[PDB]
Amino acid sequence: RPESELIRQSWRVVSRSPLEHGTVLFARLFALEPSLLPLFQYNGRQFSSPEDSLSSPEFLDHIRKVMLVIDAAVTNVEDLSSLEEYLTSLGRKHRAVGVRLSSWSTVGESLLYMLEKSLGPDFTPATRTAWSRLYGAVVQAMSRGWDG
Numbered sequence: 001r002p003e004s005e006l007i008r009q010s011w012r013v014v015s016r017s018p019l020e021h022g023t024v025l026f027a028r029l030f031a032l033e034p035s036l037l038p039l040f041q042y043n044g045r046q047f048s049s050p051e052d053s054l055s056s057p058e059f060l061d062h063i064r065k066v067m068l069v070i071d072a073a074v075t076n077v078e079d080l081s082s083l084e085e086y087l088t089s090l091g092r093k094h095r096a097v098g099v100r101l102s103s104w105s106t107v108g109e110s111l112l113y114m115l116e117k118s119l120g121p122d123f124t125p126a127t128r129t130a131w132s133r134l135y136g137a138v139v140q141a142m143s144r145g146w147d148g
């Protein structure tokens with residue numbers, strides 16, 4: 001598919017520096033939804049402010065893990081149903097940590113933003129639409145952790 005390569009070409013840019021880009025994703029995400037901030041409870045302590053997350057080595061490890069999952073979503077963009085059970089259960093983990101169903105769309109907006117930021121003019125209206133479908137397929141999978 002053409003779309004699937006568009007995701008693949010786009011991702012390449014981001015993939016190179018996962019931490020720098022995921023940092024953007026998370027700063028954006030807390031700007032949009034600041035109530036995600038206390039869900040991280042590294043050392044049984046809440047971050048007070050968004051900037052405190054960036055100083056947390058455990059938080060940065062999480063960014064890396066996030067980018068790795070989006071990475072898997074990319075490598076499997078043509079057949080994404082192979083990631084489904086993983087993503088379901090990652091969703092369930094996240095429900096437990098206290099993330100809402102509604103928060104996942106903000107993560108998708110935040111992913112999208114990180115992408116727009118990184119590709120600048122290369123973030124075509126097609127590139128956008130394709131990414132939105134990919135991550136939507138990721139939430140949709142991460143939302144089956146809310147089931148039963």
Ligand code: HEM
Binds near residue numbers: 062070094097103107
């Ligand atoms: C939406 C806001 C998010 C919050 C508040 C959040 C929070 C957390 C927390 C607190 C953990 C457990 C502590 C840790 O391993 O660092 C966790 C684990 C994880 N997160 Fe997130 N997360 C979010 C989004 C994401 C997204 C979008 C992804 C990937 C798409 C991601 C991927 C992971 C993975 C891979 C783990 C390890 C899970 C495991 O035990 O198997 N997270 N997250």
